[PDB]
Every structure is written in C-alpha cells, then in structure tokens.
Amino acid sequence: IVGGYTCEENSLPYQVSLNSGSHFCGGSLISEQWVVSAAHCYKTRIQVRLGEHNIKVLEGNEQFINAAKIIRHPKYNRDTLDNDIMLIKLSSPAVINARVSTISLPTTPPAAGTECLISGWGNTLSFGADYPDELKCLDAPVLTQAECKASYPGKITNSMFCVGFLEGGKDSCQRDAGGPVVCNGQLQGVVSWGHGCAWKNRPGVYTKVYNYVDWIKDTIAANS
Numbered sequence: 001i002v003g004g005y006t007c008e009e010n011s012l013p014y015q016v017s018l019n020s021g022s023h024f025c026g027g028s029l030i031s032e033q034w035v036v037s038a039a040h041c042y043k044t045r046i047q048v049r050l051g052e053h054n055i056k057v058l059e060g061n062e063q064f065i066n067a068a069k070i071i072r073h074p075k076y077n078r079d080t081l082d083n084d085i086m087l088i089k090l091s092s093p094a095v096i097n098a099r100v101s102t103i104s105l106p107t108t109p110p111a112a113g114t115e116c117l118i119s120g121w122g123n124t125l126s127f128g129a130d131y132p133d134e135l136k137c138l139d140a141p142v143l144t145q146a147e148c149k150a151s152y153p154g155k156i157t158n159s160m161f162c163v164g165f166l167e168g169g170k171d172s173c174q175r176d177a178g179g180p181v182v183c184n185g186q187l188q189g190v191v192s193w194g195h196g197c198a199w200k201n202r203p204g205v206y207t208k209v210y211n212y213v214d215w216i217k218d219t220i221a222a223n224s
C-alpha cells in the first residue's frame, strides 16, 4: 500500500497473509475454514497466516494453517487476469477470536463514491521497494466504470473495477494482491493489478466479488 497508514494492530481480523517462505499475497477470511484471494496468487502449497500485524516478528496472536484445497476460478485467464479470484480451504478451521474473524459477502456491487478500506503488506513506494513490517491500510473510494476503462483502455473486463484516486499518490501495490477491499463491512473487492503503484490516472484494478457470490457459496457448500 502506497500513501496509506499503519492499521491498528488486529483491527482487520479477516486479513490474512499468504506465505511460502515469505509474504507474497493477501487474502480475506470469509468463513472459519475458507479464504478468498486472487487466482494469480496461486501456488501448489500455501500457508495461511492469520491474526498477523507485524509479519516479521511473532507477537502473540498468530495462527498458521496450511491450505488443504485451492480452487482457482474455472474461467481465470493468466494473461488478461479476467476472473482473478480464488478460494483456499484451510486444513483446519481457524479459531475465531477478537483477532481472527470473518468478513461478509456483498449483496450488491459497490456504487461509485462508496468509501472502502484496502489493506496489505505490499510495497509502500511508487518507485523502488519498501515492504513494511506492519499491516498498511488505505481509505479509498470506488471509481466509475468509465473512469476505470479510460485509465486502462481495452483491459477492463466485466470481472474488474477500479478503486482509488486519479490524482495519484494513494494506491495498492505489489504483494497486496489477493487482499481485501471492504466497503460498508462487506468484501467488495480482491486486489488484482495495476500499471505502477499510485501513478496519476492509473488506479488499482480489483475483482468484483459480487459477481462470484453464487460460485463462492456453491463451491464452499460442495466441498464441506
């Protein structure tokens, strides 16, 4: 996250870190045993780290759980990042407490101008790299489809939307992908991609969670 602030420790209890030796992506806990993330974050083996604040120091509330089953969206395209969404089933259900909790599915797509909360352990710079110790947070509004499409002509599919600031300076960035965009207490977006981080007229592009409500519910029911 570029231009954000350090979240208050454990104040985003649904935020998880995806690990394979080091942090590489985010995800969102939507049920005791299930995480939502991005299809392009997929690895053969992933460890889910919950209850994290400083991801480089054990502090006392962490839960580490290895993923049992990973399901990319069947229509995911590695080149265009269409349908960039994925489900991870934990090998054991997470213990639910003040520090590790779930975030809800949306009931409608978020309207342009809705204030949202993006978060992750991604790069904090527009140039070069600084990966933070502690979880970063950004308040950012949903942008219109027209603004989105104008910022990335020809690249915005029906699965994607933009959130951020066209003036630049505040954005998601590398290794934030797969993490949450939460608006009015529902998971509306999955961090996916952009050109640069926090460049003028180059807002982050996120996967529309609402488009996959049926697929999420049915896949999870069918694999429980």
Ligand SMILES: [Ca+2]
Pocket (backbone or CB within 6 Å): 052, 053, 054, 055, 056, 057, 058, 059, 062
């Ligand atoms: Ca930690």
Ligand SMILES: [Cl-]
Pocket (backbone or CB within 6 Å): 079, 080, 081, 155, 193
């Ligand atoms: Cl692309």
